[PDB]
């Protein structure tokens, strides 16, 4: 019998191949409550889903001096910026109804550790996605390349455009 | 139809003239999702805004079997040190109260790879610029020029000069 366990990481954990200490919980011999040291290294662009079994080092017993084995599955935990989707990251920029037709000069955080600034003089289509080559996830098999990060962006619209703004408008 | 893609790169990169390898998404033929492969020779000294078109490489359509022509525009990330201006690199270093005035020996790293000392001391004039010649990034026409450096300094000034401190200023 395997046992799967969600391992929870950051995209920033197997952006850089981070390593992951941690103990988890096991019956011992004898009626006891062990808990086992478990050391991760994730590589870097390591993806949800993928396992990292652990051949007996749980619970106790095919009727005979054994431990179940322990299967870690790589989840990801929700970032406050990235979505990711493969190899690449997808971030979405909330511009205000002013910089989504008049443009814009923001600078956010890459996923890296440098930062990237995102400029634009013309007006942004609400549901146009812009992408720049490189600045995703790793690729697993050559971490060398990475995916590309796609920005959308939540133009935010005025509620009531009062009385003199509910004109220029039209 | 062209698609203009901004392409993130270091000042690093185009100052050695760096190669770009990556691979952007493209709806291909019989609603399918591609993704191809584009290698860009940076070339010493290139700007940003510097244009590499690929001719049909992207989405797909004229009515006829083609894809849109993809336009790779050049934008430099941001250098924790260094701001680029036309042929040169803007640098600000963060001078000490007692450092801009005593004076200072300092030694940052340039953008090729080679170290460069900073030394002073004479009192420097905080909203002084001092200039190294042939240390900024190379000439797009003749790589082997280079423009130059420019330093300014940060001097960090006592929030609240305590009691003696107050003092001896006058």
Known sequence: ETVQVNLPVSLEDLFVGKKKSFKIGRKG?????????????????????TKITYKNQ?????????RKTLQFVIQEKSHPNF????????YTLPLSFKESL??????????????????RVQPVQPSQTSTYPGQGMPTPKNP?????????????YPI??????KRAID
């Open 144 to 156: 060398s390349q990475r995916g590309n990060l796609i920005v959308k962006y939540k133009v935010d």
């Open 160 to 165: 009531s455009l009062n009385d003199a703004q």
């Open 58 to 66: 749980g619970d106790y017993n095919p009727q005979t001096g054994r």
């Open 29 to 49: 011999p004898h009626g006891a409550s062990e808990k086992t040291q478990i050391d991760i290294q994730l590589k870097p662009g390591w993806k949800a889903g």
């Open 102 to 119: 008049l443009g814009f000069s923001k600078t956010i955080q890459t996923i890296d550790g440098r930062t990237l600034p995102l400029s």
């Open 83 to 90: 979505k990711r989707d493969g190899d690449d990251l997808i």
